[PDB]
Design a protein around this ligand. Structure first.
Ligand code: MG
Ligand code: MG
Ligand code: MG
Ligand code: MG
Ligand code: MG
Ligand code: MG
Ligand code: MG
Ligand code: MG
Ligand code: MG
Ligand code: MG
Ligand code: MG
Ligand code: MG
Ligand code: MG
Lengths: 24, 131, 61, 60, 107, 394
RNA sequence: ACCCAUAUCCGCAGCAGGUCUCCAAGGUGAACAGCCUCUGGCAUGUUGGAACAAUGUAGGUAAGGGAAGUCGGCAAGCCGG
RNA sequence: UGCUUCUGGGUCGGGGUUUCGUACGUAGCAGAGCAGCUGCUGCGAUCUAUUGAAAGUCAGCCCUCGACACAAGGGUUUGU
């Protein structure tokens, strides 16, 4: 049937997350 | 001669004990207990017959806003006597007593426990009822 | 050894047991257990509660 | 074997729910081959299936 | 010797002590089945709907403490099994459990 | 960086193998040292912890406030049946280690001692010691045993005796008796082995070993508590409420650059069921057991010189989770390690004990025999009946 | 014809999400608030069996002190008709 | 840890202890009172006696030698 598509990009580790942020 | 045995302690830094004499003070905020070494995150606590540092929170303005030395007489926490009785009181009570041992007030309301009366002789002399 | 009676109940308190309670006015009471302690602190009449000794002395059982 | 068809049809004939439809546990094969409202009315007249009474709700 | 009908009083409390509220009465049924398998060595134990109602009379949480059970070992009817005999478990209505022995009744 | 506010460490490095002990009976690691001036005597014993009660006694210590007062203290009842001697063992002294030389069992060995050599007594054919007991009624076997004892006169240095408990008089469920080596410290090796051969196949009571007001050591296994967390075991400080990944845990294990966790880091594991050896326990009384003469039995074990009652140390309704004590018993100050029905090793004191608190003579006044199963308020059955009166059931 | 929604729609699906409306008992109660029951419906929501270890999540209770903890009365608790 | 010396575990019951606090029924010229009949009969919360009564009590409490059946079994393995 439907071929499950490529897993949608979940914009995580970027800049809006304050979980992981290096040295600024 | 006869030293003081250990008793249960239930008045840490923060307790307001009522002042059981005729000076004029109503409350006594315990600020620190005299004679405790200390350890990380342990509140110094005072039981029956303990020399403590207090401050008159409310009462006469001559007594407020200054540090007094005090002796804790009565506590509500049940403490074990040596003969095997758990004698506990109604309220938490102390008196203002200087660094040498002499009292500031004349009379003492309420009963004074014998664990405090054997240690402090001048408090036991002014006390009418004992324990 | 002084076997003192209970204030609320009237039972024979032995020196190994009991919890003694002294008020601000005096009149030092002895209590056998926390049942009698809670009954006295909630101020119940010993002559009305059935299992006490004062109820038996009142109603002649 | 399979009596949900007969229970639904008996509820539709008796004009109530299928909770109150009491089917006969002894005569299972006699009910299982009815498969029609005309046979289920014959089962009503025979008394094999019985309308359950209403569970009481007291006002006293 | 084989066909034996006899009475017992089960104390459900000493077997049901420990379990939680939603798992008291089915566990009570399970220990009654284990009791029947314990006295009578038959794996085929068929307990009665009257005793089902007698256990589930109050609720799933409050289970009665003592109960009265007629335990009967019976020879097997048709639809034969490797289990040679079975055990029928029946409720007996008794008002008070004061001085109730395990009476071995006769047929 | 360093720690800001320095703190003492939670736990001890001396006890860090906190694993479940392999042995269940308390093994003596070190017996007291012998000296030829002292006569021969047993230096250890194996009791069973029965229960706990009060005590009332006079305190005789000069200078204290508690002088001549009636204190109460926690005491342990340890039921101590007399043990049966069923063998001896000699020990030669090697530079590698104190090595056992030759073990000589007894002729008549009771079935309670026969239980120990089998794991499953029901399937076993009870055929132990059958070819060994034939050496005591033949001419050559007695000569071989005399050669064995004559070699043990010469070459053995330490002679321990084998004694097993008497489980039949005990109210426990098990029947498998515990065996134990007890080192005899006394005179020379020949006199020691002769006294052990004289005490072979004999009862050993408790008064021959211990006495009144003697400081003893208690060896025993801790009450088991299972797999517990680090807050429950090492008693560390709890993390506050706002922690996401748990609060009854250890927050930081160690530093970065040590790439391993050290052995001293408090972790979660086994709490309870640990072999321990507590020192300096004081015996208040070695009580006599039940004995029958002139028809009626004599049971006034809790009777002191000041009580003058007929009551026993068995409380009302028996001890909690142990049963009734019928054998002779001992009564120790404080609390001892182990739960109810736990085997418990008594030992004489290693340290030369000369202290003012240790050399106090105890005179008992009152022994509380109330029902420990609940809040008891009566001492004995006749006092309870005299207080209650005639009941409905009576 | 049927589904009209914790299985018939849309969310990759028998997805704790979303979707426009009608019918509207008895007691307790101011109430269409919360709880139980009557008509109707259901098997506890992609499973169970055996023990109740540590960490947890959701609930609770603590003698004496009553914010001394913490960046901060955060959370919980007190008052409640 | 236990699993046939007419001996042992277990089930039930009985005592021992202990928790709560006086059970259903019956009686009462006890009961604030109310109603009907010429003192009696009904409603009535609560109180007293029967009644330190009733209920629970090892699942991880203590003795039973009082009734009961069970318990000398089944399978896998190992040698100088
Ligand atoms: Mg700090
Ligand atoms: Mg430092
Ligand atoms: Mg967070
Ligand atoms: Mg207890
Ligand atoms: Mg349609
Ligand atoms: Mg679903
Ligand atoms: Mg569920
Ligand atoms: Mg399900
Ligand atoms: Mg609190
Ligand atoms: Mg409080
Ligand atoms: Mg602060
Ligand atoms: Mg701070
Ligand atoms: Mg808030």
């Amino acid at each position: 049937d439907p071929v499950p598509y490529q897993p949608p990009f979940l914009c995580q580790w970027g800049r809006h997350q304050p979980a992981w942020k290096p040295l600024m | 001669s006869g030293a003081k045995f250990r008793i249960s302690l239930g008045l840490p830094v923060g307790a307001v004990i009522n002042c059981a004499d005729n000076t004029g003070a109503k409350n006594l905020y315990i600020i620190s207990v005299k004679g405790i070494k200390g350890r990380l995150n342990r509140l110094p606590a005072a039981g029956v017959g303990d020399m403590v540092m207090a401050t008159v929170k409310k009462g006469k303005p001559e007594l407020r806003k200054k540090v007094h030395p005090a002796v804790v007489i009565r506590q509500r926490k049940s403490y074990r006597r040596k003969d095997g009785v758990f004698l506990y009181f109604e309220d938490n009570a102390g008196v203002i007593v200087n660094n040498k041992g002499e009292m500031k007030g004349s009379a003492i309301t309420g009963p004074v426990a014998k664990e405090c009366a054997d240690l402090w002789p001048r408090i036991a002399s002014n006390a009418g009822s004992i324990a | 050894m002084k076997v003192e009676l209970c204030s609320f109940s009237g039972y024979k308190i032995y020196p190994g047991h009991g919890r003694r309670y002294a008020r601000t006015d005096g009149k030092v009471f002895q209590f056998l257990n926390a049942k009698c302690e809670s009954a006295f602190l909630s101020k119940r009449n010993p002559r009305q509660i059935n299992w006490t000794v004062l109820y038996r002395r009142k109603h002649k059982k | 074997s399979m009596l949900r068809l007969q229970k639904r049809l008996a509820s539709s004939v008796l004009r109530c729910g299928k909770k109150k439809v009491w089917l006969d546990p002894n005569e299972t094969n006699e009910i299982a081959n009815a498969n029609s409202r005309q046979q289920i009315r014959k089962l009503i007249k025979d008394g094999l299936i019985i309308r359950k009474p209403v569970t009481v709700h007291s006002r006293a | 010797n084989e066909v034996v009908t006899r009475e017992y009083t089960i104390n459900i409390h000493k077997r049901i002590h420990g379990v939680g509220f939603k798992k008291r009465a089915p566990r009570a049924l399970k220990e009654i089945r284990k009791f029947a398998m314990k006295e009578m060595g038959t794996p085929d134990v068929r307990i009665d709907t009257r005793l089902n109602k007698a256990v589930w009379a109050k609720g799933i949480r409050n289970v009665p403490y003592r109960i009265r059970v007629r335990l009967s070992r019976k020879r097997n009817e048709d639809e034969d099994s490797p289990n040679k005999l079975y055990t029928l478990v029946t409720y007996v209505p008794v008002t008070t459990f004061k001085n109730l022995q395990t009476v071995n009744v006769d047929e | 960086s360093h720690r800001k506010f320095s703190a003492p460490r939670h736990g001890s490095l001396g006890f860090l193998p906190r694993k479940r002990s392999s042995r269940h009976r308390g093994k003596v690691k070190s017996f007291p040292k012998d000296d030829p001036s002292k006569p021969v005597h047993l230096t250890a014993f194996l009791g069973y912890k029965a229960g706990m009660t009060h005590i009332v006694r006079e305190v005789d210590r000069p200078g204290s406030k508690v002088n001549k007062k009636e204190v109460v203290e926690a005491v342990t009842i340890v039921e101590t049946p007399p043990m049966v001697v069923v063998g001896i063992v000699g020990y030669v002294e090697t530079p590698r280690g104190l090595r056992t030389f030759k073990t000589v069992f007894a002729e008549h060995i009771s079935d309670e001692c026969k239980r120990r050599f089998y794991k499953n007594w029901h399937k076993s054919k009870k055929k132990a010691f059958t070819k060994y007991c034939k050496k005591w009624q033949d001419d050559a076997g007695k000569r071989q045993l005399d050669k064995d004892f004559s070699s043990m006169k010469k070459y053995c240095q330490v002679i321990r005796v084998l004694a097993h408990t008497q489980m039949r008089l005990l109210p426990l469920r098990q029947k498998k008796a515990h065996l134990m080596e007890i080192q005899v410290n006394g005179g020379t090796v020949a006199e020691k082995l002769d006294w052990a051969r004289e005490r072979l196949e004999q009862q050993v009571p408790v008064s021959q070993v211990f006495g009144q007001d003697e400081m003893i050591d208690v060896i025993g296994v801790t009450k088991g508590k299972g797999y517990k967390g680090v807050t429950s075991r090492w008693h560390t400080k709890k993390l506050p409420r706002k922690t996401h990944r748990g609060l009854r845990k250890v927050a930081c294990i160690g530093a970065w650059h040590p790439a391993r966790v050290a052995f001293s880091v408090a972790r979660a594991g086994q709490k309870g069921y640990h072999h321990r050896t507590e020192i300096n326990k004081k015996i208040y009384k070695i009580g006599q057991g039940y004995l029958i003469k002139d028809g009626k039995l004599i049971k006034n074990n809790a009777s002191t010189d000041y009580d003058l009652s007929d009551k026993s140390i068995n409380p009302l309704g028996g001890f909690v989770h142990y049963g009734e004590v019928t054998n002779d018993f001992v009564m120790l100050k404080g609390c001892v390690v182990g739960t109810k029905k736990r085997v418990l090793t008594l030992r004489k004191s290693l340290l030369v004990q000369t202290k003012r608190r240790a050399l106090e003579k105890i005179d008992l006044k009152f022994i509380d025999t109330t029902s420990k199963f609940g809040h008891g308020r009566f001492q004995t059955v006749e006092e309870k009946k005299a207080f209650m009166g005639p009941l409905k059931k009576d």
